[PDB]
Design a protein around this ligand. Structure first.
Ligand SMILES: O=P(O)(O)O[C@H]1[C@H](OP(=O)(O)O)[C@@H](OP(=O)(O)O)[C@H](OP(=O)(O)O)[C@@H](OP(=O)(O)O)[C@H]1OP(=O)(O)O
Ligand SMILES: CC(C)(C)c1ccc([C@@H](Cn2cccc(C(F)(F)F)c2=O)NC2Cc3ccccc3C2)cc1
Lengths: 102, 102, 102, 102, 102, 102
């Protein structure tokens, strides 16, 4: 438990792409002793929870249980400028137009 | 599956210029036994989806899979600073002037 | 006594992942000959005091008593684009909507 | 074909100054068997295209083919905080003050 | 004159946390054959002068004469996402709420 | 004549601090066989021109010929977050408050 790279500490860097950090997770899932159904918790949820807020904030929005292609595409936005561009508009437009809280 | 790069997920860094990546997109291609037509996903849409959203927007800006000179010329706008030069102002007006969502 | 890396100076890179530096502070607490109890108060507090104002502002936000799997989950928000993706919208509203100081 | 250092892949890092890439486009052509005029789409245009858009926005105003003393003194504006000294404010004036689009 | 690491050229990375850099300044101070008082110019004013403007502003804010622990604690804010979360946000209100110039 | 690093091309990285590069300009000046008076024009002007526009906007502000201590102290503001802490507030106010162009 918690052996090197059991998924439990796998991590996506802010500058690490989703499709990249994923290689760091899946590969190490093999390095981890988990049933396929169990790994599904690691890929479905952990992949969202411990990996780069660009994607955590996304896969959570898409929701858990969405296919990995729906997430793979939606998470390709991850990557600073690429994400930050959309996040810039959404956030900038949140505080002011769409999410103006009063 | 898991063989070194089949052009499933080759990747453009979020800051890595499109061109560095085109050589890499192509690099896996020289190793991937992808027929030329098949390579069309590899050139056009791979070069769109996993290629850093800046090209995803730009390739959309020209048209997806535009000539390697067209997607590229336009894609030198990719990269952080590369896009920040333009995309910042445009997005900045996406929120306020051009795309103000009401 | 209070030798280098023990915990006395364990400092976190600002963008460095919560968990990463925590890995420092953990793998390094070994270097710090501490009682099992004398270790923990360093892990909940000393981790918070000298680490990532993003993870310190969060660890504090969750409120102490949050198991690592709970800290890590929240401080996974920490990060350049990682914390900027969540803070961009927030800070932008700290000034305008939520923390508007009059 | 697939040969690097022909300009077809030379590149200025998005953070990288105009000048830092100048050598990348000059020296990389030392390795390329070319004519001086032939090297000119490069010195003039690729030097404008993949050379980190901080310079493409500068060279677009300054103009292309500017002498190495001009593109230098001018695209020395290229640069992470180096351009930010000016460019941030410029984009900030591209949307709101000078180049605002209605 | 120009002797390596006399504190004259010691410096803090623009993102480097205050302390990591302080380890440099101090480590080489041990080497600069100085008196306790002399080392105190390096700790009071050079420390401030080169320590990455994220903190250079802070140390002044607390005011010099504060314990290195004092500046350190107030300088754990130093850092990219680490200093921006607290200070960039402050800049956001420098335009709108607190430093709105007139 | 025009030997490498003769000051004609010495350059400061966009992120490279003024002090660092100044060490690249001074040391390389040793490599440059120049009279002191001549070196002075290189230290006064050339240092200003090809040294990271962060400083260029600063040195120009302090006034050319400011003593290295003056250029340094102010150019310790040079840097990514370090210059940004100031410059972001400034450019932002160049568009809206102080330099609003009508
Ligand atoms: O660290 P921050 O103050 O948040 O800003 C950084 C910094 O930009 P600055 O030049 O303004 O300091 C990086 O510069 P480097 O020191 O890494 O060169 C830049 O890098 P690039 O020019 O290469 O894009 C990076 O972007 P990234 O994290 O994509 O590498 C950008 O961060 P933000 O885009 O998140 O604001
Ligand atoms: C949205 C994103 C892509 C991430 C982006 C947007 C804008 C910038 C630069 C301006 N800007 C504009 C053009 C070129 C440069 C360059 F760096 F290339 F020289 C530059 O600094 N301002 C913001 C940077 C930042 C980070 C967090 C808090 C505030 C700011 C202001 C940088 C990055």
């Amino acid at each position: 438990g918690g052996s090197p790279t059991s998924i439990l500490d796998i991590r996506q860097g802010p500058k690490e792409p989703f499709r990249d950090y994923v290689d760091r997770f899946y590969k190490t899932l093999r390095a981890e002793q988990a049933s396929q159904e169990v790994k599904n918790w690691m890929t479905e949820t952990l992949l969202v929870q411990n990996a780069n807020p660009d994607c955590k904030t996304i896969l959570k929005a898409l929701g858990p249980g969405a296919t990995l292609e729906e997430m793979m595409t939606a998470c390709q936005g991850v990557g600073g400028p690429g994400h930050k561009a959309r996040v810039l508009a959404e956030a900038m437009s949140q505080v002011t137009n769409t999410a103006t809280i009063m």
